[PDB]
Amino acid sequence: LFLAQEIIRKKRDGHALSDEEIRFFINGIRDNTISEGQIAALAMTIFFHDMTMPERVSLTMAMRDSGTVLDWKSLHLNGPIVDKHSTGGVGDVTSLMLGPMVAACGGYIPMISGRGLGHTGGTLDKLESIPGFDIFPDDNRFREIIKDVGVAIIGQTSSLAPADKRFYATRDITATVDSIPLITASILAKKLAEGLDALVMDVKVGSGAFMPTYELSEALAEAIVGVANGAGVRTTALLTDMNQVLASSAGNAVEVREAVQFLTGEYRNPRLFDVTMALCVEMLISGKLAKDDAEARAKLQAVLDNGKAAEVFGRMVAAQKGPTDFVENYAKYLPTAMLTKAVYADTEGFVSEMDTRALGMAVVAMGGGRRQASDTIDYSVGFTDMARLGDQVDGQRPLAVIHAKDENNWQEAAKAVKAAIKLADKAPESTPTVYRRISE
Amino acid sequence: LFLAQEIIRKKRDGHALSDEEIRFFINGIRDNTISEGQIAALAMTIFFHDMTMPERVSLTMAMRDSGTVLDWKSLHLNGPIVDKHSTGGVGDVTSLMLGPMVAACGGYIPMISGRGLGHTGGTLDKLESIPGFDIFPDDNRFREIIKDVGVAIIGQTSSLAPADKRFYATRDITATVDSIPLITASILAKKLAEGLDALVMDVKVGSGAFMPTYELSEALAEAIVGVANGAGVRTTALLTDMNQVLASSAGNAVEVREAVQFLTGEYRNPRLFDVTMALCVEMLISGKLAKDDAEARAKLQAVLDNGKAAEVFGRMVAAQKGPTDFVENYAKYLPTAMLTKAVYADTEGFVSEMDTRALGMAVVAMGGGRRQASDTIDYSVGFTDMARLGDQVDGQRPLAVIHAKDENNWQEAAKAVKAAIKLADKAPESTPTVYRRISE
Ligand SMILES: Cc1cn([C@H]2C[C@H](N=[N+]=[N-])[C@@H](CO)O2)c(=O)[nH]c1=O
Numbered sequence: 001l002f003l004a005q006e007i008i009r010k011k012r013d014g015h016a017l018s019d020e021e022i023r024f025f026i027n028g029i030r031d032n033t034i035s036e037g038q039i040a041a042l043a044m045t046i047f048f049h050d051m052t053m054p055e056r057v058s059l060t061m062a063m064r065d066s067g068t069v070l071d072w073k074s075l076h077l078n079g080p081i082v083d084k085h086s087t088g089g090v091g092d093v094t095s096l097m098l099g100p101m102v103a104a105c106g107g108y109i110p111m112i113s114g115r116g117l118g119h120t121g122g123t124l125d126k127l128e129s130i131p132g133f134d135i136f137p138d139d140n141r142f143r144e145i146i147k148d149v150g151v152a153i154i155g156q157t158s159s160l161a162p163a164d165k166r167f168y169a170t171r172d173i174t175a176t177v178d179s180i181p182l183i184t185a186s187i188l189a190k191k192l193a194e195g196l197d198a199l200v201m202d203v204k205v206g207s208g209a210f211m212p213t214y215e216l217s218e219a220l221a222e223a224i225v226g227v228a229n230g231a232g233v234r235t236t237a238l239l240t241d242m243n244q245v246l247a248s249s250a251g252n253a254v255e256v257r258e259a260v261q262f263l264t265g266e267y268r269n270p271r272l273f274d275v276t277m278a279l280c281v282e283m284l285i286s287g288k289l290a291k292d293d294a295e296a297r298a299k300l301q302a303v304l305d306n307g308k309a310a311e312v313f314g315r316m317v318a319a320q321k322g323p324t325d326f327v328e329n330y331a332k333y334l335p336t337a338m339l340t341k342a343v344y345a346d347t348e349g350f351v352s353e354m355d356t357r358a359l360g361m362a363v364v365a366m367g368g369g370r371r372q373a374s375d376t377i378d379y380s381v382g383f384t385d386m387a388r389l390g391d392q393v394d395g396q397r398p399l400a401v402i403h404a405k406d407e408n409n410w411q412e413a414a415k416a417v418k419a420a421i422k423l424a425d426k427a428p429e430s431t432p433t434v435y436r437r438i439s440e
Numbered sequence: 441l442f443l444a445q446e447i448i449r450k451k452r453d454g455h456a457l458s459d460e461e462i463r464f465f466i467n468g469i470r471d472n473t474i475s476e477g478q479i480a481a482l483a484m485t486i487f488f489h490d491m492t493m494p495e496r497v498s499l500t501m502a503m504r505d506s507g508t509v510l511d512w513k514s515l516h517l518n519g520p521i522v523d524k525h526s527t528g529g530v531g532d533v534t535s536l537m538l539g540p541m542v543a544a545c546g547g548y549i550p551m552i553s554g555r556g557l558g559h560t561g562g563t564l565d566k567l568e569s570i571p572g573f574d575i576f577p578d579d580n581r582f583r584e585i586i587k588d589v590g591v592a593i594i595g596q597t598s599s600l601a602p603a604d605k606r607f608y609a610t611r612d613i614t615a616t617v618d619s620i621p622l623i624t625a626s627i628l629a630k631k632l633a634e635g636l637d638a639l640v641m642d643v644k645v646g647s648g649a650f651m652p653t654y655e656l657s658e659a660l661a662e663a664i665v666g667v668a669n670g671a672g673v674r675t676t677a678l679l680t681d682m683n684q685v686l687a688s689s690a691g692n693a694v695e696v697r698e699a700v701q702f703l704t705g706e707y708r709n710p711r712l713f714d715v716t717m718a719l720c721v722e723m724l725i726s727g728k729l730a731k732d733d734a735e736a737r738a739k740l741q742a743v744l745d746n747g748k749a750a751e752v753f754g755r756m757v758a759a760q761k762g763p764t765d766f767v768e769n770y771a772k773y774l775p776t777a778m779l780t781k782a783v784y785a786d787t788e789g790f791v792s793e794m795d796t797r798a799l800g801m802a803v804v805a806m807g808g809g810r811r812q813a814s815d816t817i818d819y820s821v822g823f824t825d826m827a828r829l830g831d832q833v834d835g836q837r838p839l840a841v842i843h844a845k846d847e848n849n850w851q852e853a854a855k856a857v858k859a860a861i862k863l864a865d866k867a868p869e870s871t872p873t874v875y876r877r878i879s880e
């Protein structure tokens with residue numbers, strides 16, 4: 001003894017770790033007695049040897065239990081505790097509508113979300129375009145908001161799955177991010193710390209997805225579903241498309257605008273609608289708020305149609321210290337960019353493919369995301385009026401409208417947008433927005 | 441960029457690293473820009489995927505070049521620069537005779553050695569039983585001693601292969617010590633920093649060896665020979681036996697006594713003689729001081745017989761600030777133990793096997809070695825009069841004579857010695873002391 005090196009050795013040599021060994025190691029990460037080198041070594045043994053279902057469950061539970069785990073029972077709420085997690089993308093603004101929609105249908109959604117990562121936007125960064133919006137309410141205040149409003153969207157505190165914090169920080173500099181068991185455990189350590197009854201996972205497929213192939217997207221989804229249900233949380237996953245921007249916009253303020261306009265019925269991108277609705281349906285069914293797809297859809301459509309979902313969003317924004325008249329007066333509050341100007345393709349044709357990773361990185365480069373954690377976001381910049389795959393583009397239809405912080409910035413963004421998009425003389429074959437549903 | 445994570449990823453996915461990539465990574469270890477996690481991750485990828493001959497050479501050269509490399513040309517010496525390295529054992533005192541013997545035959549031996557490790561003794565710890573003996577002469581003083589005496593035995597300074605220091609420190613807590621390419625590179629990074637013409641490797645086989653099987657001992661030897669010769673240093677290896685104590689003693693002062701008595705011809709353990717002579721013969725042949733085995737042996741025997749090797753040892757001890765009359769008066773200087781008492785077997789029989797790892801750990805437990813680096817050694821304790829495999833033991837022949845720091849200490853050592861040794865009603869089959877020689 002001590003065990004940490006023995007545990008690494010055991011996994012290195014292809015043996016399954018016991019629940020005891022996994023818990024010991026995770027606890028050692030938590031109390032800073034296990035070093036970065038030892039975390040990295042174990043991570044790499046897992047990359048090479050994988051983990052069985054029991055190992056994956058142990059690892060997930062251990063990481064979940066390394067910090068605060070929320071419990072709702074004592075509020076005596078009359079609805080299920082339910083949430084959604086996305087692997088991330090570009091224009092992936094679903095949460096801003098989905099939280100209010102499900103809340104309006106009787107769910108309670110304690111959504112611990114995230115900032116932008118690599119080429120992907122982040123829900124917390126989008127919300128921080130709203131002046132005053134506070135992603136870090138205190139423990140008691142968060143509980144009040146969930147009780148009174150039904151939904152809140154917040155950041156990850158120091159008390160949330162702290163062993164995952166160090167594990168992920170090490171993974172991200174040692175080429176051990178790309179491991180299904182590690183990703184599954186990391187995602188669920190955080191989501192399961194919310195004290196959920198039910199969860200839906202959105203695993204992205206395509207050029208803007210983190211997993212590089214459909215098959216790997218599918219395997220991740222399967223892993224998460226298996227582990228989460230193993231933990232007593234009713235969970236399903238949808239594999240959904242990220243071969244183009246999902247919303248009609250990409251950025252921060254611009255995506256909040258899109259969310260509001262979706263909720264009020266001004267404008268609804270049909271692909272964003274399809275994904276948002278499908279994810280909400282899973283939450284209602286898993287949360288036992290509806291018996292089937294048709295009933296779920298009817299309830300969700302009703303709260304869009306009668307303004308209830310929009311009202312919940314407004315109440316959420318107010319409760320998290322944004323403006324009390326935000327839905328009504330968002331234009332007053334959301335910052336506008338210095339220069340807003342359309343980018344047109346160099347030729348006429350059909351949008352045939354769009355490197356959605358490259359589009360994501362273009363927004364980062366404009367100042368709408370970060371390359372390092374200390375970077376400051378410009379909340380106004382990004383894209384609107386995105387062309388979709390199959391759109392005919394010409395002098396009357398741009399590839400996008402670019403919201404830029406100055407003219408030099410606009411030129412570089414326009415260059416990146418054009419480079420990311422290929423035109424063809426025929427429309428590409430259409431693709432489903434939702435490829436598949438994975439259940440226990 | 442930067443490359444460190446990309447380099448780990450590349451090796452992780454089974455690709456050979458370039459010389460450039462290896463040099464960059466080693467330099468990053470040297471200047472502390474590459475973290476412990478990144479060292480551990482790379483180490484583990486090498487454990488899983490191994491390294492080709494070109495990778496192994498690059499890694500070795502990079503680590504060698506991370507610090508000071510000695511050059512002798514400017515002293516205009518008339519003999520080869522030659523050295524020996526052992527993988528370590530119990531009673532493995534060969535260097536104390538071999539350095540002086542080879543020096544007396546015209547070699548120059550700048551021996552950078554080591555302290556005890558795990559169950560094994562260390563030449564530097566043995567030498568530090570000699571009052572005043574200084575293992576850290578300054579650069580210029582070391583050169584004077586090599587010029588004037590022909591041999592000196594010293595410790596590893598902060599300037600020696602500093603990238604190896606951090607690499608090994610990480611390996612030793614992350615279960616990445618046990619890798620042939622990593623061991624080879626670590627050993628040779630240090631030895632090749634001596635500016636050698638020739639080198640002999642002693643790779644131990646058996647229960648007191650670090651490599652757990654003959655086949656793995658053999659593979660390590662082959663790796664070291666290939667890499668060293670690739671680096672322009674004429675190198676051979678002997679696989680030698682460590683299924684019992686090599687010398688008739690194990691410890692610090694007790695082994696220095698044995699060395700002196702070997703050199704003066706008072707007493708020569710025949711197995712220790714065989715290994716010592718065989719290693720010296722390799723050095724003379726590789727260093728071109730003799731054309732064949734017979735001539736080498738004749739020259740080495742002559743310097744034993746005429747007192748020259750003993751005189752060189754005395755001059756080395758004096759030059760390194762030990763006593764000037766040490767060979768003559770060692771009994772005055774080497775510390776004696778509080779209690780010296782024979783341990784007898786519980787029954788009569790032939791010594792059939794001896795767990796030489798356990799015997800090594802018994803010396804550590806007596807206070808003759810360390811469990812952690814801060815531990816203080818008692819230089820007097822250990823074993824003498826070791827029984828050998830095939831010895832009949834009874835009331836007239838003990839298993840060993842134990843030199844202990846007090847009576848409680850003696851009892852625990854006696855218990856460990858008895859537990860480490862199995863008797864049989866017949867002598868075991870004899871085994872060679874030198875199994876094989878490996879050349880380029
Ligand atoms: C932010 C974060 C990302 N990741 C993974 C999820 C993403 N993979 N997928 N799908 C990946 C992107 O580098 O990082 C993680 O495992 N834990 C975390 O806390």
Ligand SMILES: Cc1cn([C@H]2C[C@H](N=[N+]=[N-])[C@@H](CO)O2)c(=O)[nH]c1=O
Pocket residue numbers: 527554557558608617622623624626627650651660
């Ligand atoms: C002291 C030291 C040991 N080691 C290895 C050599 C030993 N293996 N063999 N033969 C091993 C013992 O744990 O550590 C190393 O690679 N570099 C070092 O600096």
